[PDB]
Amino acid sequence: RRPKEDAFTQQRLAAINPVLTPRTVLPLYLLIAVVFVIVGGCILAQNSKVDEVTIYYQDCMTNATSSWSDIPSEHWQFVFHKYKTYNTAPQWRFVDDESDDFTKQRGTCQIRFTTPSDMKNNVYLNYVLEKFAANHRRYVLSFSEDQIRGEDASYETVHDATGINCKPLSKNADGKIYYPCGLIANSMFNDTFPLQLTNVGDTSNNYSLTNKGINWESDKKRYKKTKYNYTQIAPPPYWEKMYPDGYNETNIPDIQDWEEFQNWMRPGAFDKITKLIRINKNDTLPAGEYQLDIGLHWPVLEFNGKKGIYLTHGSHLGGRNPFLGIVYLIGGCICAAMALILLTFWLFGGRKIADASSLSWNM
């Protein structure tokens, strides 16, 4: 018969009509401006006191000498807030390796840098890569979520799977299933990093860098130890220098307790890849000169790509990036400027708020 009631069947809900009167806009454009400038300065000040050491060593094999020599100013970038003019050009030294027959990348780059300040109790040494394309469509889908999960997936489950499957690197010419399959695991950054920052001045106390805990612990709930039988799997086409005899009863890598692999199996979204490779969560890194021994294996000059180390204590908003503070300050300043312009319009020429004589029919 008759309709219902209560203020819902009839659109009579308890509402709030937001009339943007100048007595509510200005208390909003200012409450937003001061908040976005307070956080705009709090972030930019927190970001300013962030030490950072970037050292690109992609040109260490063909531009460094057997003796110590300063790194060209185009590679390294030091940013210490306590020392704004701390050039202190770090040195490097390339010791070749005639045993290794990989001419494109071999030997060892020893980089001696000098930090004039400490890094509080949590030092991250990532490796940065440039001009390495790890975000392409065929690449990022080139892995098997069955081998990562620890299953001994056959060639059908590994190759004939859904969009996420190792299409170009499913099986070798012999007939084995690459255990870490796909362009992702195959193309892994294999430059070996030291487990301790060699102290140049006082070699009695070396700053130890562990490789455990460099990835999320939850990742160990997804990357599980394999269940293969070393008779069906072969190293990826580029892991054949790490496993020249293929696989046997022992040398099968445990991807659960191999956090560099789990870091690399997370493809970098952009053209610059920066993945954590060494961490120190116990000791503050004291000021002084330190040497890092990187075993050059991963070639980058073939595609003009760059590779380097990135040492930092970090921050709460990540590393040192003058964007969040800058954009917060710009947002606050824009809010304040537009509010001043609105106050000018309301003062230097405008209507009464509820001006009934300004309606189109009252003209």
Partner: protein, 884 residues
């Protein structure tokens, strides 16, 4: 199965919602503009995918990048296709199902309205079509009907002519029309009129209580107010006037064709049934006069009154025929206009009867339903000719004409009626509201045109300052009608407007959208209209003439005539037309309009079934057009650009990731964000806006009806607004992508512990958070009123985004996050990016809105400022000016 299930189940729930609120083919204009906007969105998608394919090919034909070392022109085609698969949510089927949900909800909200439900006959507003509700918010023309829509079709006997003398006392609406047209103070004499009718009816009811036991029903149906007849029938002229009024009462109580059968369920109440209301009014006013009809019978009319017994068997009943409107029947002792009975006289006798003819002119003053009753009062010859003429040959017409010409000449008048049809409760206020809203309403009246214009002046369709361009062109007297109608229309168009031109003005008015200025009035009759809509040039000429502000009356119209009028105003000069009406002719009038409202009036519900809406009284159309119409129109006009903007803000953001990655075809978002964004993340806020957003309260939208002029002028929804929302979506997508990227761009270690974000899925979480928050806050910014339901559901949509990221990632089935929520939502970098990204998405739009509500504020901004100040605060919740 969870692939494409939600579509079918929502189709079923929409169908069952349509089939639930209905038991107790016409597409709107917004839908066609929606199709065009979808075409434009597809053009944007094609441009995006073409640029993606071009840049991907250029990259593949470039320097030896890192592709050919670690990854091992049909390449352009496959890149274009994977881009189409990437950028495909620009315009999905979600728009065409969300719009249907919106229209269904708006229709069931029109239905469930309590101020549109008529408790008299228990019939709420039942939308016969659930797809045209925004069509009501842009209605420009209303083609009403005087039959039973404006007037309640309840005939009331007011005056009469006994012995050539007028008897009766009633103040009709046409008298008020004369008083308003001549310039008398109307709406003021009503007070003293009521105060005198009070004592008049008081003495009336005292006379009834002192006369008899009043065996009739309760005094609510005692429509007898004219005491003058009862005063003069007793002793004014002695027994002469008594003899005349008794003869009149007998002629009206025995000569009739009403089918009386008092039953269902008690024989106490009367069940007088007749196809014509005039006979029912006559027998009712003869019963209430004092000559009631107690009891019932099958054969004959046995009437006992205080001792007198009346049963005069006629032995033959002459039913009313619609072609001739005449029957020769004289009652033994032991019907239309003057074109059938009059105009046949001796080309010096019967002068007093001629005086009675002048009474017709007095009946032309008030415009009632009148007729003449002339009976001719040696006895054996009468019954002999009766029985020999009752069995004539060839349909009984030749001998009937013979006798009607030889003996039925120069009759004497002994009867005459006068019946009025008053407007429904709240029709003048409704017309005043629809006129203030700028709706040019046409009245397709019926029988008489003089009464039509008088009633139009009685209601608020006619008023002062108007120019009554009378186009009743039937001849020189007040030769061929075509040329004189053409000359009169041209003279009016030339001397009342500056309209030197024929064809250019039609296109000029089509590109004008309609603005009624300079209140005028036009009146057409049957023949002048049937000659006005046939010629192609005459059609546009009459249309340019009838583009006046409010008053366009059309009398003596046929069903096809009014249908063709609605077609002429609809097809030519394309506008939105409403055709409220009731009856069989109004069926054809309705079926050929943009919106057709049907009044549940007479027994025939044909105009209710074959319509779009069905209201009880005519007044409801105001609330159907001024409140619900404008509401749904602005709701759709905001939703559609909101929808396209919220799709752009996501697709363009997925495209911006193609700058990097060289448009190779990798998704920035997870495979399940691409679906849940348009399905669950940002779908409910915009729908609840388009369903529950109120421009202003119903009281404010009826107090300031001129707000409706935003729909008549199409000032709310246009392609400019859609393009502006799409450009805002492009900019906001730029922000939504490049704020998380610029957070990452420096060192890519924005994770608060260096453990490592920057899987493209996590940057996608960043971007999707910014985009979902900006979309919901945008829907809330552009919502006129923030209520307990839409704001709650915007908060709940944000919570759904967050909670389902937390549910999907905290499960091994995600296969690439496994911790995306616990890894992204926990870093302060994420919230720091999100807050400033939302600020930079909402700041330029909110600022342009502020500098618009300050410099060039629309009429709704001013009305809302007044409505917040507390102008419209003296009115209750459910207020409507259309009520007694």
């Amino acid at each position: 199965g969870f692939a494409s299930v939600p579509l079918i189940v929502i189709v079923i729930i929409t169908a069952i919602k349509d089939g639930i609120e209905d038991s107790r083919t016409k597409k709107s204009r917004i839908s066609r503009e929606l199709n065009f906007s979808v075409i434009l969105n597809f053009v944007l998608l094609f441009i995006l995918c073409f640029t993606a394919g071009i840049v991907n090919g250029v990259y593949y034909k470039q320097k030896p990048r890192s592709r050919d070392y670690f990854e091992f022109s049909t390449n352009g085609f496959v890149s274009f296709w994977v881009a189409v698969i990437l950028y495909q949510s620009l315009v999905p089927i979600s728009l065409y199902i969300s719009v249907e949900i919106i229209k269904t909800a708006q229709a069931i909200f029109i239905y469930t309205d309590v101020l549109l439900y008529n408790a008299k006959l228990d019939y709420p507003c039942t939308p016969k079509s659930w797809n045209i509700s925004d069509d009501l918010g842009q209605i420009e023309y209303i083609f009403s009907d005087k039959t039973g829509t404006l007037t309640q079709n309840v005939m009331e006997f007011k005056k009469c002519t006994i012995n050539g003398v007028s008897y009766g006392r009633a103040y009709t609406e046409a008298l008020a029309g004369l008083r308003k047209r001549q310039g008398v103070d109307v709406e003021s004499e009503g007070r003293r009129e009521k105060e005198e009718i009070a004592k008049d009816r008081e003495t009336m009811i005292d006379e009834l209580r002192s006369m008899s036991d009043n065996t009739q029903f309760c005094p609510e149906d005692l429509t007898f107010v004219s005491k003058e007849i009862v005063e003069d029938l007793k002793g004014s002229s002695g027994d002469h006037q008594q003899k005349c009024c008794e003869h009149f009462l007998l002629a009206l109580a025995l000569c009739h064709s009403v089918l009386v059968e008092p039953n269902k369920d008690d024989p106490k109440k009367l069940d007088i049934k007749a196809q014509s209301p005039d006979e029912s009014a006559l027998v009712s006013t003869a019963r209430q006069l004092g000559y009631s009809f107690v009891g019932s019978s099958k054969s004959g009319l046995i009437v006992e009154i205080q001792g007198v017994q009346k049963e005069f068997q006629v032995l033959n009943v002459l039913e009313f025929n619609s072609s001739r409107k005449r029957m020769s029947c004289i009652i033994k002792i032991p019907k239309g206009a003057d074109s059938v009975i009059y105009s046949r006289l001796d080309r010096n006798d019967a002068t007093l009867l001629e005086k009675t003819a002048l009474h017709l002119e007095e009946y032309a003053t008030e415009g009632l339903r009148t007729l003449c009753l002339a009976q001719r009062e040696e006895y054996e010859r009468w019954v002999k000719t009766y029985d020999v003429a009752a069995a004539s040959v060839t349909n009984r017409e030749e001998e009937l004409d013979k006798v009607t010409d030889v003996i039925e000449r120069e009759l004497i008048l002994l009867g005459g009626t006068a019946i009025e049809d008053r407007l429904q409760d709240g029709v003048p206020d409704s017309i005043a509201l629809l006129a203030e809203a700028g709706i040019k309403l046409w009245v397709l009246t019926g029988d008489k045109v003089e009464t039509a214009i008088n009633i139009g002046f009685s209601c608020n369709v006619l008023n002062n300052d108007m120019e009554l361009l009378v186009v009743k062109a039937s001849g020189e007297d007040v030769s061929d009608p075509i040329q004189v109608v053409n000359n009169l229309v041209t003279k009016y168009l030339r001397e009342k407007f500056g309209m030197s031109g024929s064809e250019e003005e039609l296109k000029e008015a089509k590109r004008e959208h309609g603005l009624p200025q300079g209140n005028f009035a036009v009146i057409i009759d049957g023949d002048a209209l049937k000659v006005a809509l046939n010629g192609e040039e005459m059609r546009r000429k009459f249309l340019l003439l009838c583009k006046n502000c409010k008053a366009v009356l059309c009398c003596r119209v046929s069903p096809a005539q009014k249908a063709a009028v609605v077609k002429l105003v609809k097809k030519t000069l394309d506008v939105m037309t409403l055709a409220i009406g009731d009856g069989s002719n109004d069926v054809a009038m309705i079926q050929s309009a943009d919106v057709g409202v049907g009044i549940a009036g007479e027994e025939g519900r044909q105009a209710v079934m074959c319509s779009d809406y069905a209201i009880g009284q005519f007044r409801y159309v105001t609330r159907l057009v001024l409140v619900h119409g404008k509401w749904c129109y602005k709701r759709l006009a905001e939703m559609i650009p909101q929808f396209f903007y919220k799709n752009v803000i996501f697709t363009l953001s997925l495209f911006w990731y193609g700058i990097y990655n060289n448009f190779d075809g990798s998704y920035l978002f997870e495979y399940t964000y691409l679906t849940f964004y348009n399905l669950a993340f940002t779908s409910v806020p915009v729908i609840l806006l388009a369903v529950l957003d109120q421009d202003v309260s119903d009281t404010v939208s009826m107090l300031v009806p001129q707000l409706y002029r935003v729909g008549i002028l199409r000032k709310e929804w246009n392609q400019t607004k859609f393009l502006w929302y799409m450009l805002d979506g492009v900019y906001q997508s730029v922000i939504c992508f490049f704020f998380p990227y610029l957070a990452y761009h420096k060192n890519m270690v924005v994770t608060e512990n260096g453990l490592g974000l920057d899987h493209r899925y996590f940057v996608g979480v960043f971007v999707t958070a910014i985009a979902v928050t900006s979309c919901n806050f945008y829907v809330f910014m552009e919502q006129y009123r923030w209520d307990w339901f839409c704001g709650l559901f915007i908060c709940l949509s944000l919570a759904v985004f967050y909670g389902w990221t937390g549910i999907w990632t905290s499960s091994s089935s995600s296969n690439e996050f496994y911790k995306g929520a616990a890894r992204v939502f926990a870093q302060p970098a994420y919230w720091a990016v999100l807050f400033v990204g939302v600020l930079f998405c909402l700041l330029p739009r909110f600022t342009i809105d502020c500098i618009r509500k300050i410099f060039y504020p629309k009429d709704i901004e001013i009305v809302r400022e007044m409505w917040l100040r507390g102008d419209f605060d003296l009115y209750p919740q459910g207020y409507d000016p259309t009520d007694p």
